Amino acid sequence: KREHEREVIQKAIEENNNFIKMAKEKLAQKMESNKENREAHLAAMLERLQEKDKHAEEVRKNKELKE
Amino acid sequence: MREIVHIQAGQCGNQIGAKFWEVISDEHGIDPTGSYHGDSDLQLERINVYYNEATGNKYVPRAILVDLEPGTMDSVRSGPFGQIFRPDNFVFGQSGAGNNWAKGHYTEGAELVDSVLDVVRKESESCDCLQGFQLTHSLGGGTGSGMGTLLISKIREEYPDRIMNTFSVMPSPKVSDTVVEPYNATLSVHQLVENTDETYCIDNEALYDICFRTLKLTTPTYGDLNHLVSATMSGVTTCLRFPGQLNADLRKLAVNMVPFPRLHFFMPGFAPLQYRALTVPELTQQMFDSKNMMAACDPRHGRYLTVAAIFRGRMSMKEVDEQMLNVQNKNSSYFVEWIPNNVKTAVCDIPPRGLKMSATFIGNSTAIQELFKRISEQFTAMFRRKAFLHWYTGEGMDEMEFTEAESNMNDLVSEYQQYQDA
Ligand SMILES: Nc1nc2c(ncn2[C@@H]2O[C@H](COP(=O)(O)OP(=O)(O)O)[C@@H](O)[C@H]2O)c(=O)[nH]1
Ligand SMILES: Cc1cc2nc(/C=C/c3cccnc3)sc2cc1C
Ligand SMILES: [Ca+2]
Ligand SMILES: [Mg+2]
Fold first, then answer.
1. Residue whose CA is at the smallest distance from ligand 2 atom 13
2. What does the UniProt entry say about where the protein is found (chain B)?
3. Does domain B1-259 have CATH number 1.20.1080.10?
């Protein structure tokens, strides 16, 4: 009975610790996934704007090849 | 010298325990300060049974006060006979048990139990000849139920050859604090079946009915309920605390009352429950009446294995003997025929306060199964849907332990039904 008393209280500790472990990992996964997604969102936005620069330079270059 | 160590655990256990000490201290003539101021040497002849003699001729109860929260024990220390208790014998935590058997038995209570055992050991070591242990508690809560039975388990390990008796308050939906009371009670009963010699089953439903139907109290409080318990506990311990014809310790009393190890759950009774004194026939009639039973079980639904009856006051012992022989010979169908002379009677000259004479009933009836059946119904009603189980599994318990406790009490019930049809 004594060793059962030990098994119960250490099962309580184990479950409480696993809950904290899972929560910490799930949160770390989400904040990391979010960081990658938001950066990629802004990376794609700036790349389009940097594409407008490439197009604008070709416009001025195309006019330059008419003079 | 036949010393008894008293232990009280939890809210109910301590409030009832305090009232018990409040009552017997009055009977022995001990004031709240611990000084004796009686009027008879008979009050001191067996004073050592429940009291330790202090340095300055004071009498300090051999009591140990246990709780997981300081709330109730602060109330005791601030009570009438609060200063009479040994300060070191106040063992308490801070967390509480939250009406949870698991917290009392496995987690919170486990952290405190060794501290209690040290006090128990300290009291036991200073006993010339330890007679046994005595626990007051409820089974529906967390501390008295969970830690109470854990303490019993520990005491049986350290004192395997000592008598372990309990005054256990059974939960009831009529007088309830939480819905998990049947869970806590079922878990505790399994412990009591194996680890106690005598358990006085005090049903709060019975106590409520007595206060309402008989005592004509419209709104019974716990205080009113504990008044009945206090008076019963005084009566049960009367022959142990006072000189008389009965020369027996806890063991000898257990031997004559318990024919089967597991079947040791008694139905307490008391009479009267007024200026007009009762006659001996009236005492005997009421004493066997269901309305004076405190286990909320009808004795006519079962049979008596053994019966003990204690009369207090100056009365015709011949008339008492005749009246006891009257009830038995008028209702012989309710007493088992395979145990000759199973009804024993003792008389004490000193009556309790307020009454010129009284009577206390101790019945080992098979009708007590009605109480366990009732608890088992309430248990199964929730457990079949695994309701409120998360409170317990969160403390490390498994569903299997519940299934096992449920099965052991159904076995207990079946065991009682076995001897009812004998
Ligand atoms: N007779 C009586 N029963 C009580 C008292 N206090 C609580 N109870 C019962 O005991 C159960 C609650 O257990 P409790 O002792 O309060 O919890 P604990 O402190 O963890 O042991 C409920 O079923 C209540 O009906 C009391 O003072 N007198
Ligand atoms: C036959 C008989 C039995 C009996 N048993 C008693 C129990 C006393 C007790 C007190 C405190 C704790 N545990 C048990 S009183 C009594 C009186 C008679 C006649
Ligand atoms: Ca702690
Ligand atoms: Mg309570």
1. B165
2. Cytoplasm, Cytoskeleton
3. no
